[PDB]
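Ticket 4471: requesting a sanity check on a complex prediction with chloride ion. Repro inputs:
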Amino acid sequence: VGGPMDASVEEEGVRRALDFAVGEYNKASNDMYHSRALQVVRARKQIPAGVNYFLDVELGRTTCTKTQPNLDNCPFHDQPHLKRKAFCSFQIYAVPWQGTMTLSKSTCQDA
Amino acid sequence: VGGPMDASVEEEGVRRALDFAVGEYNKASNDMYHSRALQVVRARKQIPAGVNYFLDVELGRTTCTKTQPNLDNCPFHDQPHLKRKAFCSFQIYAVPWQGTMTLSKSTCQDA
Ligand SMILES: [Cl-]
Ligand SMILES: [Cl-]
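Returned structure tokens:
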């Protein structure tokens, strides 16, 4: 199967996660009334096998549109008002066995 | 120190993560021009030590406001138009050594 395994709602981690999630639900609702669990239908857990990459990168705007080929060695804008350079910090969460990546954090400032 | 460790931009995982992040940057920008890396200033990696909880929970709206005490055993609304019950799926990412939790996924449907 390879998926999450059942875990008792009495287990300290499960209960903390339940209290946490319900607390976030209530914090984010527009409701003046409090909601709480009537019933936990299923509680499971899984240890993920991932890795985080943290990249600090300067990006430059190229003279190529996104609709044209050979993008990787496309020259950068040189004309004063068309050029844009940004310093970006990217945090990527990868799960190698699964072949997936997710961009967890991304922020850019002008250069 | 305990933080992310430097990793060469030539390493296959780092380069895939770099290509991925730049691809997401371009997909999300409103720019008709393509941007690409001028320079990688820093590239690091870290294996996180976390666990995922997956909870399927029925929530009910209580008669208590969020501004009053004893919320955990507050009765549920019984009056026809004030009661609300939701079935929610919550995925919580916990990092036990750090004491933190993040709500990675949260969706609710009416009951
Ligand atoms: Cl465990
Ligand atoms: Cl590694």
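Notes from triage: The pocket of chloride ion (ligand 1) is lined by residues A 45; B 51 (CB under 6 Å). Leaving this open until the requester confirms.
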